[PDB]
Amino acid sequence: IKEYRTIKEVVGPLMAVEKVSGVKYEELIEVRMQNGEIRRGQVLEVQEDKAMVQIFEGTSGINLKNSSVRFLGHPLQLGVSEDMIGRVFDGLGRPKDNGPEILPEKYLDINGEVINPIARDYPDEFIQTGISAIDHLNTLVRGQKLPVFGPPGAGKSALAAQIARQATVLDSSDDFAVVFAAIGITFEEAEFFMEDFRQTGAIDRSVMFMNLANDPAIERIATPRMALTAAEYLAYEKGMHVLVIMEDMTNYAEALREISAARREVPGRRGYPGYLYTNLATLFERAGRIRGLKGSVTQIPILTMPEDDKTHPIPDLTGYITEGQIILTRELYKSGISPPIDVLPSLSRLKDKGTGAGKTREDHAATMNQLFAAYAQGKQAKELSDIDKIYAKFAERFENEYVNQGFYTNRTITETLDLGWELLAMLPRTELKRIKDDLL
Amino acid sequence: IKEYRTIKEVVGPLMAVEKVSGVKYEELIEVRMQNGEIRRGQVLEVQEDKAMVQIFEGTSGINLKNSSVRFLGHPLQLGVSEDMIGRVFDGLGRPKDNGPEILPEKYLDINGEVINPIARDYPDEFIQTGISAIDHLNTLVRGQKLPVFGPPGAGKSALAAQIARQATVLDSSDDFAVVFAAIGITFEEAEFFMEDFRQTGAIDRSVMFMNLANDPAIERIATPRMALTAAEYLAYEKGMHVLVIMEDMTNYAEALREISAARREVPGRRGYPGYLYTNLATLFERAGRIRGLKGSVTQIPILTMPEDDKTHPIPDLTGYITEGQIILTRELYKSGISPPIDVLPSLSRLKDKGTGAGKTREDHAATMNQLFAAYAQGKQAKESDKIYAKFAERFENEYVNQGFYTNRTITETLDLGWELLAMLPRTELKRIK
Amino acid sequence: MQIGKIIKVSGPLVMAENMSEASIQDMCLVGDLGVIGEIIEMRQDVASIQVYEETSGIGPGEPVRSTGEALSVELGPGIISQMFDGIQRPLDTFMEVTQSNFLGRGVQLPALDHEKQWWFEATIEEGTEVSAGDIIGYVDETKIIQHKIMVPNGIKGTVQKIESGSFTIDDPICVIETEQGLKELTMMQKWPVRRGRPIKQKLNPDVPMITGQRVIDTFFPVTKGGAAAVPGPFGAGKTVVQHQIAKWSDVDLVVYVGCGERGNEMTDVVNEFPELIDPNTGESLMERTVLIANTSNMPVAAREASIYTGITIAEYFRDMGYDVAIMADSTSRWAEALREMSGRLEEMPGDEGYPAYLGSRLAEYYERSGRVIALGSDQREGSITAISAVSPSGGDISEPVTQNTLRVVKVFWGLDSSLAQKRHFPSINWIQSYSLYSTEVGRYMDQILQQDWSDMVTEGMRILQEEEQLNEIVRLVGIDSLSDNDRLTLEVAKSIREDYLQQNAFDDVDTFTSREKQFNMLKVILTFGKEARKALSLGAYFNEIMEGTVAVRERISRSKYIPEEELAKISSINEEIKETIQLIVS
Ligand SMILES: Nc1ncnc2c1ncn2[C@@H]1O[C@H](COP(=O)(O)OP(=O)(O)O)[C@@H](O)[C@H]1O
Ligand SMILES: Nc1ncnc2c1ncn2[C@@H]1O[C@H](COP(=O)(O)OP(=O)(O)O)[C@@H](O)[C@H]1O
Ligand SMILES: [Mg+2]
Ligand SMILES: [Mg+2]
């Protein structure tokens, strides 16, 4: 058990340890304080017989001469087992549910490893979010990276909860699992998530990593990578189709800027790290499917946009990543619409791999195209005569019945499509582009 | 002169040499690498124990302990002689023609010296470039600094070859020479110039210094000083009227910013060094004439435009150091008109001292002014004024468009202008004609 | 032989002592894992190494071993139809050796098969005096391509013994007694990635390359040795244009370089190239391709080096006299890798955070292409044609990468998202795009077609330009405003756009249009333009012409679909056109 009693210098969150041997870059450490308090840290630098570390909880109260540093001999790791489903952890993969101690099959590097370009497979089949405006129009496929954006307080937390409890896959024998990671969420909202997850029984399908707004920022960095490591284990080793949901990754970006500022790495994107884009890119790129392996990992990141005019590095991060998008809007949130999805700007690039026959149903693409076109022109009607009373009434009925379904009420794609037909009939029967005469 | 195996340190393109003595700031360096390859360098800074040098060809592959450095005991020089005319060199004054290599009369610090302002002579004479609207409407003067611009891939580089071939002086009492400096242009552009010169025979009055886009940036910075040193030698020591043409000075500024970043110097506006203005000044201010000495150094630098966007430091600073401006534009070029010179934005601030009676001919100033304003209203009407707009149309196709391979006599530029104003009623001036 | 010791590890930068014998830019295997790194500095015996992989878990005391070379490429039999990353690591051999889907750290695999058996057929007589570049024999690496074993650079002398035989690329196939001694030759030579390969002489690229893409080859063509930037927004093309040129170009070899793109954008090419067997030779495209693959998450140094590794391979193949085409998709990702490593080195920014050397780096890359007289006695001729896709974020071509590229390339095919939404998917905006080769290739095509081709190209461009100007008066004052011949000018412009400019990548006949076919298809459109104006000069009206030319104009519509055996049909069109109008004019 390696531990040194040689702290020479502490400056802010950083400590200088001396007469050291065998310490490695980014290895984990524990500062065992002179009072017996233990604090976690990481190795920033190792120089000959010296090591500079950064203390996660800060260096308050530390007496240098009567404390020691234990060198754990490994990087940041996740304990890994099939027992994780039905369990709740914190930002560091430590349990928070008071549940039975889990024996990891193995510990894996939280960064994971990078896919061989040869071995990567196309995203294909269909994940049923249980939400029409997603499942039907902006279809989520397994292996896709589909983020949801919005302004503060736009149902995105509730929407993420709904997708977490209602998402499943239809024809796969080997079952669906969902990994939920909350990033810097207030205790009230995390507790709300827990009561909802527990009442719905969705925890039994889930692995949850909860990080709170007052948690250490470095834990906010670790949480999404924690989630993706668990997802990659379940998907590529235990063969599951895994859905990863990440709340307020904007909170993640701010925490990453915070950690960078503590390390004094003079950064140049409005104080943000500068590699902010590359960090999110390496994080976002961790989705997809591997050749010859039945598993899949899917990401739904949730982010917050202050305004479209306001220039910020975080929205431009989103610009570098998107493979589609689902957009929530405040003016629309007020209207009482349950998922406030402005359907026009939201897009899914890979919708067509998930739609079809044997996947969703034959009517999927057809219904989607007609609904979108008619809704665009009919909303612009809400903005004579040929602006159809029928059209604008269809747009408002579409928003108040079809897109609004209840955060606790899931629409199967069959029922989504059947409702689509129900209200699609209230349209001029020969005003539709339909190369297959439908005859429902 | 001795060889030093005293290489202590290499960080990027910078070396630290140790146990030096009698090393001077800006002195030159030769590194004999462990494999025998020779690379030249320049001292940036020199102390008692040590000197810092930057290697032109870079520091790649250098083994420190088994390489040697020799301090050449002189700065960047140019070996000059009259034998330079007809020859083409690289950015460093080394031959590229496979020709009879020169034995110089002497070596001159390519930094040169600054003319005593008392001894400076105000520019006051005519140079026939052979392009009608340059010689006529926007007339170039001996010793003047008048730059030209261009859109990427729009013929701004063909105008240089044309100007260089047709540039001459009428009096011909002393000979006229043109110095062409290529600054970070592609191999295809440099080849176009070299072959144009060789096939037209303009090399026979020319000295050419060619620096390529993939050449080292420090060499790119050196190039214009090599050229202007040769020009000042030909003009102020051999009495020639020299025309210095610099192809793409925006590339000069890019190379200067690149060396400034390489040396971690405090950035100026948008990365460009804080000394960028004065550094362009030491180039531009090398034009002119000297009291009591025949011979002129005349400069026309060519700059690629910032593409009608927000103000950029180099046009701004050039304008603060130069006087005039000329513009080339795709709007005339893709209309098929060549040279695609926009007459309205163009100007020669020193024109009035180059043209008059005894320089060109009587009917020059009135032609310049009258045809200019007539084209202005003709274009504004074009885009019964019976045919006042058609005056602009003809000015476009016959007066401006003379051809990249046509050397107009100055008098026939004047004659064509006059025959064009015949369209306009004679009710326009109080002059004899 | 010298073992260095790590004395410092801080993120990407490792400092190792006792490495006096290494050289700057030497590659090293760092730490116990042996992760690859590059010497950027040296202070006494202490080298600063910038490592290419993650340094997590590496610390002082561990060994560092220099590979005695800079980033280099292995060149020899076994290179074709392989898929490397930016540093020439065999991706399939990763699959096999490491038995995993992931790129582990510090695992070294030789690029080529040093165990494979190849039949060397010698072609030099014993006693022949050789200098660098001389072909000493060949191996038929594929059914298509002859891999020509050349004597390496820096070697001169007399062949002492050489005999045909079955060997490895490690076995000696030839013996050269140079001035210094006798040293055997192998089938493989290494070359540093960042240093261009020596040539006898650089030439102008004046021969046009046959893309089979009508837009390009007629209006914005790229010569064998030229350089073409493909700047456009997403979905416009520029991955299909890369593919299309790689398929149908009249070039021996193709080096496709994936510059750290998104994972799925690479998955596409990874699967789609093998089934792109063009029938000009009847063998697969991979049979003539070297593919460098890099994804967004892969090591930054690999993404940055990708294009240089690729162009080194392209140089190695044009040194045998071959024509090579190098494809970069996309150089914007390459520049982002460059910027990332410049920032992590704490360098001084230039524009948009890009390094100050961005421009000069781009010039260094593009000037390594071109037409060249290769080394060797016979003075072979080779060419490298560079086609580089750029993805300016938001389609802004004012951005540093595109502006610096456009500074040195001489071909610009600017993709326009508006045409793509219009499904004019050879989105190459005819007004904005250009080629500075157009006049030289015009003279070339005038002589070898022995027709007045360039007159036709100027006429087509003229009607397109006038189309642009007349569509504005259409938008503001209506189509009825226009002259009768003005409406004719627009309709012949619609002909040139829809019948000639648009070209489907996935139809067997439209995907490639030969020079002969290009000439005839354009000619019939232009003869239509000529005859109808005469009708108006006589007094016939535009509608009078259109009603009566419906059929002949549907024949020009299908001109692109007539196969390469039956171009007499297109030749028949223009004459049939002429006879048809004379009946309408009355
Ligand atoms: N109606 C509202 N308008 C504006 N801001 C709100 C509103 N409701 C909540 N907020 C702010 O946003 C936070 C929660 O928003 P968010 O995290 O997006 O989840 P949700 O959208 O589900 O409320 C709250 O802590 C509150 O500060
Ligand atoms: N020349 C072409 N012919 C037919 N379709 C094309 C052509 N170029 C592009 N496309 C269409 O555009 C789609 C995507 O274009 P792509 O080359 O991937 O653009 P990007 O690389 O910008 O994403 C292709 O699937 C194809 O359907
Ligand atoms: Mg919330
Ligand atoms: Mg692409």
Author numbering:
A (entry chain E): 2 to 384, 394 to 450
B (entry chain F): 2 to 384, 395, 398 to 446
C (entry chain B): 1 to 586
Question: Which lines from the publication concern this structure?
Answer:
V1 is a part of an ion pump V-ATPase, which transports cations across the membrane by ATP-hydrolysis-driven rotation. V1 comprises a rotor composed of the D and F subunits, and a stator, a hexameric ring, composed of three A subunits and three B subunits. However, the details of their sequences and structures are different, resulting in two different interfaces between the A and B subunits in the A3B3 hexameric ring: a catalytic interface, at which the A subunit has an ATP-hydrolysis catalytic site; and a non-catalytic interface, at which the B subunit has a pseudo-active site, which has evolutionally lost the ATP-hydrolysis or even binding ability. We used computational design to restore the lost ATP-binding ability of the pseudo-active site in the B subunit of a rotary molecular motor, V1-ATPase.
Next, the nucleotide-free crystals were incubated for 5 h in the presence of ADP by gradually increasing the ADP concentration to 10 mM, and the resulting structure, A3(De)3_(ADP·Pi)1cat(ADP)2cat,2non-cat, was solved at 3.2 Å resolution. In A3(De)3_(ADP·Pi)1cat(ADP)2cat,2non-cat, each of the three catalytic sites is occupied by an ADP (one of the sites has an ADP with a possible Pi) and each of the two designed sites out of the three is occupied by an ADP. This structure proved that the designed site has nucleotide-binding ability: the designed P-loop (green) exhibits typical backbone geometry and accurately binds to the phosphate group of an ADP. However, interestingly, the ADP is bound in the opposite direction to the design: although the β phosphate is located at the same position as in the design model, the α phosphate is located at the position of the γ phosphate in the design model, and the sugar and base are at the interface with the A subunit. Note that, like naturally occurring P-loops, the designed P-loop grabs two phosphates. The observed unintended ATP-binding mode probably originated because we designed the binding site only in the monomer B subunit without considering the A subunit. The designed P-loop (green) firmly grabs the phosphate group of ADP. The sugar and base of ADP were found at the interface with the A subunit (cyan).
